[PDB]
Amino acid sequence: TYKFVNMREPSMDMKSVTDRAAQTLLWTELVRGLGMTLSYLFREPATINYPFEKGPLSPRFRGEHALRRYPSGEERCIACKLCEAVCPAQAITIEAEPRADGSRRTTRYDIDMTKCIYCGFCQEACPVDAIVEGPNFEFSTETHEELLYNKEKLLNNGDKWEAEIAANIQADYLYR
Amino acid sequence: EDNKQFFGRHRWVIYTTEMNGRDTFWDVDGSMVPPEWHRWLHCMTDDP
Amino acid sequence: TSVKPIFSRDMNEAKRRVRELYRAWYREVPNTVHLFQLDISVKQGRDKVREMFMKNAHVTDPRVVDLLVIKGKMELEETINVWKQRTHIMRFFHETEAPRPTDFLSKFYVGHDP
Amino acid sequence: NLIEVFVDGQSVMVEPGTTVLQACEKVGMQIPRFCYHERLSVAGNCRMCLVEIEKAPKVVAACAMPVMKGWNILTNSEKSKKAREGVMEFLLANHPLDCPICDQGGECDLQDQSMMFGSDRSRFLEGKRAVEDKNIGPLVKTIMTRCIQCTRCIRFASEIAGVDDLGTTGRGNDMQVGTYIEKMFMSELSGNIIDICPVGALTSKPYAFTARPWETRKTESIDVMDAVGS
Amino acid sequence: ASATRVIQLLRNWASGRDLQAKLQLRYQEISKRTQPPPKLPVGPSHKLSNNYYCTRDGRREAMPPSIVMSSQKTEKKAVTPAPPIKRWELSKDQPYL
Amino acid sequence: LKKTTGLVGLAVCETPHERLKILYTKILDVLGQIPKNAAYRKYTEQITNEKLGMVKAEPDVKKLEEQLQGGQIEEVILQAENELSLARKMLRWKPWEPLVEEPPANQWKWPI
Amino acid sequence: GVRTSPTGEKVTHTGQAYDDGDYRRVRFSDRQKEVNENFAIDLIAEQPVSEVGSRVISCDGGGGALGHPRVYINLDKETKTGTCGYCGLQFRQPHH
Amino acid sequence: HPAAHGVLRLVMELSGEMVRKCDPHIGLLHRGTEKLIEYKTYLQALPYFDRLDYVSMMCNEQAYSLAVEKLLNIQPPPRAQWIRVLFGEITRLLNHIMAVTTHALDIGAMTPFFWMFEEREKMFEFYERVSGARMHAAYIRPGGVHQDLPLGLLDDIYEFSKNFSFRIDELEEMLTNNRIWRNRTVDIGVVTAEDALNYGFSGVMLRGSGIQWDLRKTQPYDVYDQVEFDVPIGSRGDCYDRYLCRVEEMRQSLRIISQCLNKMPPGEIKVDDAKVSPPKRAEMKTSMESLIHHFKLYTEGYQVPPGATYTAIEAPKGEFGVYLVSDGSSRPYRCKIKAPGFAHLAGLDKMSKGHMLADVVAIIGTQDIVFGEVDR
Amino acid sequence: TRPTIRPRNDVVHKQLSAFGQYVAEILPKYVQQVQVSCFNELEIFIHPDGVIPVLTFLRDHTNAQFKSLADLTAVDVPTRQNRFEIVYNLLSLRFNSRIRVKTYTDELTPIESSVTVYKAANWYEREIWDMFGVFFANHPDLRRILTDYGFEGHPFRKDFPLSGYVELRYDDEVKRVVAEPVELAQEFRKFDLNSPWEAFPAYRQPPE
Amino acid sequence: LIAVDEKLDITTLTGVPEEHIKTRKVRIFVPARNNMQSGVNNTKKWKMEFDTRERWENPLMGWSSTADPLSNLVLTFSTKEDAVAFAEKNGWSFDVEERKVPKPKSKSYGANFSWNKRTRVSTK
Numbered sequence A: 001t002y003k004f005v006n007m008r009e010p011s012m013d014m015k016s017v018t019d020r021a022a023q024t025l026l027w028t029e030l031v032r033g034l035g036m037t038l039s040y041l042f043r044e045p046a047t048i049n050y051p052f053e054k055g056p057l058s059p060r061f062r063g064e065h066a067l068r069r070y071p072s073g074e075e076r077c078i079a080c081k082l083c084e085a086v087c088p089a090q091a092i093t094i095e096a097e098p099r100a101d102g103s104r105r106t107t108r109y110d111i112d113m114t115k116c117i118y119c120g121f122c123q124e125a126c127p128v129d130a131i132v133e134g135p136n137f138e139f140s141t142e143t144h145e146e147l148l149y150n151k152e153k154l155l156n157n158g159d160k161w162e163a164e165i166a167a168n169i170q171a172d173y174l175y176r
Numbered sequence B: 001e002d003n004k005q006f007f008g009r010h011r012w013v014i015y016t017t018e019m020n021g022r023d024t025f026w027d028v029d030g031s032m033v034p035p036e037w038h039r040w041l042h043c044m045t046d047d048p
Numbered sequence C: 001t002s003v004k005p006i007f008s009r010d011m012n013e014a015k016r017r018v019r020e021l022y023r024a025w026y027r028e029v030p031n032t033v034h035l036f037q038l039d040i041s042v043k044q045g046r047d048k049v050r051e052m053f054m055k056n057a058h059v060t061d062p063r064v065v066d067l068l069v070i071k072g073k074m075e076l077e078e079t080i081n082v083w084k085q086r087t088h089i090m091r092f093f094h095e096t097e098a099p100r101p102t103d104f105l106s107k108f109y110v111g112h113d114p
Numbered sequence D: 001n002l003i004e005v006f007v008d009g010q011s012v013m014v015e016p017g018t019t020v021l022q023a024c025e026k027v028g029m030q031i032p033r034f035c036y037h038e039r040l041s042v043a044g045n046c047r048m049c050l051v052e053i054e055k056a057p058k059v060v061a062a063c064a065m066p067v068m069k070g071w072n073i074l075t076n077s078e079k080s081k082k083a084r085e086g087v088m089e090f091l092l093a094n095h096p097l098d099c100p101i102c103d104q105g106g107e108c109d110l111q112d113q114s115m116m117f118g119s120d121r122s123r124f125l126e127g128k129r130a131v132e133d134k135n136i137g138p139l140v141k142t143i144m145t146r147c148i149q150c151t152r153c154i155r156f157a158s159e160i161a162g163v164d165d166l167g168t169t170g171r172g173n174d175m176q177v178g179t180y181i182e183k184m185f186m187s188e189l190s191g192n193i194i195d196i197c198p199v200g201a202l203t204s205k206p207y208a209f210t211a212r213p214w215e216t217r218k219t220e221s222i223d224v225m226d227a228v229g230s
Numbered sequence E: 001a002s003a004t005r006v007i008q009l010l011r012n013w014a015s016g017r018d019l020q021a022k023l024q025l026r027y028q029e030i031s032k033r034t035q036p037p038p039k040l041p042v043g044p045s046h047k048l049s050n051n052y053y054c055t056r057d058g059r060r061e062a063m064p065p066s067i068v069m070s071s072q073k074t075e076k077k078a079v080t081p082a083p084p085i086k087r088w089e090l091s092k093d094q095p096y097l
Numbered sequence F: 001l002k003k004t005t006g007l008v009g010l011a012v013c014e015t016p017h018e019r020l021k022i023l024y025t026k027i028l029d030v031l032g033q034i035p036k037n038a039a040y041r042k043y044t045e046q047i048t049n050e051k052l053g054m055v056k057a058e059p060d061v062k063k064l065e066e067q068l069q070g071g072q073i074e075e076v077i078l079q080a081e082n083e084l085s086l087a088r089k090m091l092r093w094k095p096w097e098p099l100v101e102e103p104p105a106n107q108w109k110w111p112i
Numbered sequence G: 001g002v003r004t005s006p007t008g009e010k011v012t013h014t015g016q017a018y019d020d021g022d023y024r025r026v027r028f029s030d031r032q033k034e035v036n037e038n039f040a041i042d043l044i045a046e047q048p049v050s051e052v053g054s055r056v057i058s059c060d061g062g063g064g065a066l067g068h069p070r071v072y073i074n075l076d077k078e079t080k081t082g083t084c085g086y087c088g089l090q091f092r093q094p095h096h
Numbered sequence H: 001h002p003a004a005h006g007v008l009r010l011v012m013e014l015s016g017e018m019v020r021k022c023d024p025h026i027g028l029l030h031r032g033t034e035k036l037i038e039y040k041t042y043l044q045a046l047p048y049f050d051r052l053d054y055v056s057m058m059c060n061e062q063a064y065s066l067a068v069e070k071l072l073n074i075q076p077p078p079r080a081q082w083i084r085v086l087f088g089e090i091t092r093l094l095n096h097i098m099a100v101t102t103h104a105l106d107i108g109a110m111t112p113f114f115w116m117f118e119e120r121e122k123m124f125e126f127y128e129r130v131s132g133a134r135m136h137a138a139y140i141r142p143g144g145v146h147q148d149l150p151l152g153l154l155d156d157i158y159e160f161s162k163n164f165s166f167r168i169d170e171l172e173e174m175l176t177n178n179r180i181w182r183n184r185t186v187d188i189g190v191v192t193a194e195d196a197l198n199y200g201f202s203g204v205m206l207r208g209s210g211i212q213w214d215l216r217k218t219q220p221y222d223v224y225d226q227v228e229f230d231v232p233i234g235s236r237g238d239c240y241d242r243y244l245c246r247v248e249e250m251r252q253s254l255r256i257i258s259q260c261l262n263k264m265p266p267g268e269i270k271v272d273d274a275k276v277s278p279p280k281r282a283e284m285k286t287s288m289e290s291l292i293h294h295f296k297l298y299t300e301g302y303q304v305p306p307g308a309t310y311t312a313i314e315a316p317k318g319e320f321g322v323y324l325v326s327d328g329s330s331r332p333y334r335c336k337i338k339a340p341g342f343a344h345l346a347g348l349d350k351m352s353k354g355h356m357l358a359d360v361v362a363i364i365g366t367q368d369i370v371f372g373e374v375d376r
Numbered sequence I: 001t002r003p004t005i006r007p008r009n010d011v012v013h014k015q016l017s018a019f020g021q022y023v024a025e026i027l028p029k030y031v032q033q034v035q036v037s038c039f040n041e042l043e044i045f046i047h048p049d050g051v052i053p054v055l056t057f058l059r060d061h062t063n064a065q066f067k068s069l070a071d072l073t074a075v076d077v078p079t080r081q082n083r084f085e086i087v088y089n090l091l092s093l094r095f096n097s098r099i100r101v102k103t104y105t106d107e108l109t110p111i112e113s114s115v116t117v118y119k120a121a122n123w124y125e126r127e128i129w130d131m132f133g134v135f136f137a138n139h140p141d142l143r144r145i146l147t148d149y150g151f152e153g154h155p156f157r158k159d160f161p162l163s164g165y166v167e168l169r170y171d172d173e174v175k176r177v178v179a180e181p182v183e184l185a186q187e188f189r190k191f192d193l194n195s196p197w198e199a200f201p202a203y204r205q206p207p208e
Numbered sequence J: 001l002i003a004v005d006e007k008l009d010i011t012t013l014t015g016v017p018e019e020h021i022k023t024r025k026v027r028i029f030v031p032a033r034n035n036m037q038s039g040v041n042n043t044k045k046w047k048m049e050f051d052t053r054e055r056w057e058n059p060l061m062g063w064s065s066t067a068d069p070l071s072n073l074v075l076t077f078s079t080k081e082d083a084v085a086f087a088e089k090n091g092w093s094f095d096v097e098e099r100k101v102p103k104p105k106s107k108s109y110g111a112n113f114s115w116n117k118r119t120r121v122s123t124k
């Protein structure tokens, strides 16, 4: 079905003609627009008091990255390179070798945050929940090099945000 | 917290005047909050 | 095998089109130097036009010549209409590229390139 | 003289004694396999290559069944698909969940043939089997929970390398592959067991954990360590 | 919202509508940020029997396009790509604005 | 009769039946120059005679539009004009001749 | 378990440390080098060994669906402990 | 230029202020999206479509997903289809708000911009709650949707839809009957129906010119054949008529959103086929087949049977099409993206004949061009 | 019920097959092949010089009113003698249908411009020329549309590198942006993804 | 319809730099089967790829850098003649490697139990 947005004709009776002439000479619809803006003036503003107030977020929010640990302190990442394989932008560089104790662990884990598109495929592809996208989004730097995270930086982010990251994963892990 | 205010303005933080070793009387950042209060303020949970 | 000609049929008509395009480019260099405020000479511009024409002097297929003159007309109209900037006109001159060595000994010294 | 056989109704002339697998190969169809290697003997125990003959009530082992005159080999029939699904179900029922920590990873025949010929779901609601890992030297790393008892390494060891220190001990679901003693499988042709093992049970120890198959670039060169010119 | 009664009256008179009925600011009427744990369904293929992938394989039922006519290889009525599209009906809900 | 056709740039015709008859007769005359065995000629002659029979049988515009199933009568007239121009061009092109040239051996193979 | 190189530079858990004559140390002047203080190898060594009276045990890292893929470790060799290789966790049978 | 949307170079010849010709120079936002898509797999190429028309993001995702599922010969589950339709209509509301407010801002009016962008902020919150990304969600995928809705999303969407017709009414109070707006828009950029069809216009351009055509009604996709809505039809084919059509399309999208909320069915969210869509995390961490399929899907990707398809949807800016060619591998062989704004910008020169500079600005606004999708 | 498999439309398949036979009969001079894919898409393969007659027929004929040019692209297949495959997507609003018309050409062979049948062909053919090097004979204004000014090479060809050969930076010595040979801080990591096990037997080619 | 008695050559139209037109030797070949798998589906199409050039280590982050535009460029061809024709018309030098197919082998399960031959297996 369909409807005509503009196919109405005005009546030509004297009362309607006089009303249209009054609208032409006396700017009725212009005063109407003025009244609408005055109403909005007296309404309550919709501005938050940043940075003392923050907009709502969800447990699914994708922000700054982090590498997690097991509750015993061991790193979760096992150098499986699934995140490196699935990364759309090829932002992850991983190099690994057997550790001293024989574990499969990474020696290099780089994420170029200027190449990352913050899509969250890496945390979907991780089989051990090692790499996650934390809730942090205020991590702007003053130089380009500071956005080239390495394994030490990501582990520090994980250790710093572990409580909030664990809470978000607990909240949203039943939908995954 | 003030639930009477409209959503978004119902929670707020007054930052400290000195954090770690930097004087933050006027220079207040949005990253000065610990992660738990960060989650509480950004409303990923209703429990402080 | 008979093939569909773009223009020019045989090679002589392709050469005629080449000469017409060369005249059009030759009469445009002073205006280009004036409008773009280039610091190069008019002689330098004409020499660059000549050099860019000469690097295709080994072509023997009339269709390839026709395509070359079509592209030359395109890049000439990008210059007459000032669609190009001074940046592109000077990109023709490689003013910032370092001179790559060409002798075997220098190439051996610099690196592994053939 | 050549005998005429049919693969999916297409005629093909094969020499007598040719197997169903080789006839399908001649017509261009590669039958799934785990224990069959053309350089080794025919074992026929993984049962992954079962195919249906048009009139036969019973599926045959394609890798070991010679073709007869006028056979129609239904490679993509319902019986063949169900047979492949059942065999893959058994294999993955006992296999361990070690793909991310497994060097075989993206170049695993169990994974590829599971993705092409098997089901997408698991019905195994029991406990799995865990097997003690053996040590056979500094070159080959054995994680024998991933073994699928295809006996390729045994056949290769004996037939090719002339070394008879590999075999199966025990029987039943507890059947194990190993030396039964602390013996190192040291030979000049040891890494070929790393190559022929279809799963990650036998993996290169110097290459352990370093890379994944999809990352690497393959350069086709020759060998200079000896005068054979491999 | 929090406002004086006179201010509300002036807003309603100027705008011409009862604004408190349709407010653009959310006051406790939204869902809580914490919810009970869900339990999502499984699906149609989570059976333990009579569930063979060969009978539910979408990709393997794809076929190469059928060659209707190939150069290499009574009075028929003229045909159309499809039956002509029927004329639309004018909306009953609100035919004109 | 109707004020507008509802389509921008398409005017209303006061004489739809006469214009349709003229256009269909012109189309039929043009098709007479096409060879009899040409597959193009038979089909368009059939559809034109089918539509020419309808326009000479129904005097009401609305009923004729419903019977033709081609939209509005102005759209039908426009389609008749397009068909006439195509008939002239096809008379020039002569597409009923055998195939110009078969493609190379592997020209439509896919995947490849 | 951080360690200090002879040049005064901290050593990462991967053993990274710039050489004495390496020019790349200039990037750390007037700035700092990012090294994580916690060493996962040290912590997992600090973890104890769980004794279970079964030949085969299963580890999922703890948390169930929040851990790692469940794997089964065979505790038959009495000369060493069985290690879950996802989480590096050691298990043993009650001896003596 | 404020009116040039950032990456349009319009080389104009003016006699005085009358426009003699328009020569749109595009490609200032050409990135090589199609070449990069050729180099990525099918799952890795989804965000590329997310970033093409960055004002109708879930609509682009839906078009790409429909094309890939048509090639794969699979079917999304009913709940996934209803979620797709619901978020497609929410995306249409977002896009039409952006279009109308930016058009009015190029004209000179800004208060509606601010109001309707507050509404856009609320819809962005919906996007972020389902997906975690405020705009580039990458939520609609071949086989269904990535995740299920949280347990309050439908209630909040109901509240938003309940309080939105008043916002549209306030928008109309400032523009619909305003004589200044009527003077600026009426009889500007008139395009005839035949010209629109030949030049290749689609969507609001055709409907404003008066052609009764809509893909959601004629060639339905997902569950658009189970919802009732009206298709606005213009009469004069100008900027004012296209503005009226867009406002009425916002109201009809409100209708569709209400129907989707009331008819949301239970069930799963992605095709129950682990060879195309990934299994759940618990199954991946307990089942060997599920772990294998997770590994293979996220490293190599599913293979798509060879073939070429052209699938189009009624995106908010017109017909958005994808011509996808697969050679049987895990990566697309060819992917041509047909953006509706390409043809409209091609037709910009004809529409601006005999007009002035401000008229050309209004014509660009009424065409509603996004140069991300124009240039690709 | 088979909830995970796309249902098929045999009625539409039959309609498309009938119309393909119809057009192949009407235009034997140019039409070389007609196909219907199993998801109901009609595809017509013609001789490259039949573009104008075939498209004019499909636009003006009463039983095929394909008044809208949905799309116009090309596909580069190096293994063919005529590598470029020009594809026309047409939409008929009268019969609520869509059709595809495919022709072939190589680097040096022009294709007649269809700006006289559809007006969108102007920018579509400009883009085809810009990205593939295919020349269109009677084009009102043929030039680059998407690439940079003075850009050399046609990027969408299969033999063109992903990152091209030049890159841009601002040089302070000359006070302008300059073009220099491409040099990457990190090289694009090429992944070999194809599995060595055949996935779809229905598409298997003869061993030859 | 004109007739040209010339070899096709489009190097002047491709836009490739003269260095990468002249100093490049592509390799036309059928890829060898990956020994780690028994599948043979990747050994059916010819490939054309360029010779390897220098890759060095980035001073920052230690990544692998390159300066060769054609390092990742691999083309797929259905036939050796098609691949050679493409290489010739684009002007690159080329080395062609003939396809290697396994020779047919006589397999018999009954040979595992020969009465007097050495093919008898000591285990199963």
Ligand SMILES: CCCCCCCC/C=C/CCCCCCCC(=O)OC[C@H](COP(=O)(O)OCCN)OC(=O)CCCCCCC/C=C/CCCCCCCC
Pocket (backbone or CB within 6 Å): A024, A025, A026, A027, A030, H179
């Ligand atoms: C001192 C403070 C005054 C404050 C007044 C504020 C008014 C509200 C302010 C908002 C308006 C500002 C933005 C509006 C600017 C544009 C307004 C506008 O368009 O007005 C022009 C308006 C529109 O014309 P069109 O629609 O284009 O029709 C043309 C047909 N060919 O036309 C006008 O000329 C109206 C101007 C007012 C005319 C005065 C009314 C005349 C009535 C006469 C009766 C009295 C006769 C006196 C004799 C008495 C005998 C006893």
Ligand SMILES: CN(C)C(=N)NC(=N)N
Pocket (backbone or CB within 6 Å): H002, H005, H006, H102, H370
């Ligand atoms: C950049 N984009 C998308 C805009 N709409 N820009 C604008 N200035 N209106």
Ligand code: SF4
Pocket (backbone or CB within 6 Å): A083, A086, A087, A088, A089, A090, A091, A092, A111, A115, A116, A117, A118, A119, A120, A121, A122, A123
């Ligand atoms: S969020 Fe996406 S783009 Fe960023 S590192 Fe993860 S996979 Fe790569």
Ligand code: SF4
Pocket (backbone or CB within 6 Å): A076, A077, A078, A079, A080, A081, A082, A083, A084, A094, A122, A125, A126, A127, A128, A129, A130, A131, D100
């Ligand atoms: S997917 Fe997870 S375990 Fe695998 S390499 Fe990436 S972060 Fe490590």
Ligand code: SF4
Pocket (backbone or CB within 6 Å): D095, D096, D097, D098, D099, D102, D103, D104, D105, D106, D108, D109, D110, D111, D146, D198, D199, D200, D201, H292
């Ligand atoms: S052998 Fe194959 S299936 Fe088994 S864990 Fe390794 S990669 Fe996975």
Ligand code: SF4
Pocket (backbone or CB within 6 Å): D146, D147, D148, D149, D150, D151, D152, D153, D154, D177, D196, D197, D198, D199, D201, D202
């Ligand atoms: S170790 Fe490998 S080669 Fe040996 S039987 Fe087991 S799966 Fe086969």
Ligand code: FES
Pocket (backbone or CB within 6 Å): D032, D033, D034, D035, D036, D043, D044, D045, D046, D047, D048, D049, D050, D061, D062, D063, D064
């Ligand atoms: S391959 Fe034949 S049974 Fe194993």
Ligand SMILES: [Mg+2]
Pocket (backbone or CB within 6 Å): D104, D193, D194, D195, D196, D197, D198, D199, D200, D201, D202, D203
């Ligand atoms: Mg191995």
Ligand SMILES: [Zn+2]
Pocket (backbone or CB within 6 Å): G059, G060, G061, G068, G084, G085, G086, G087, G088, G089
């Ligand atoms: Zn564990």
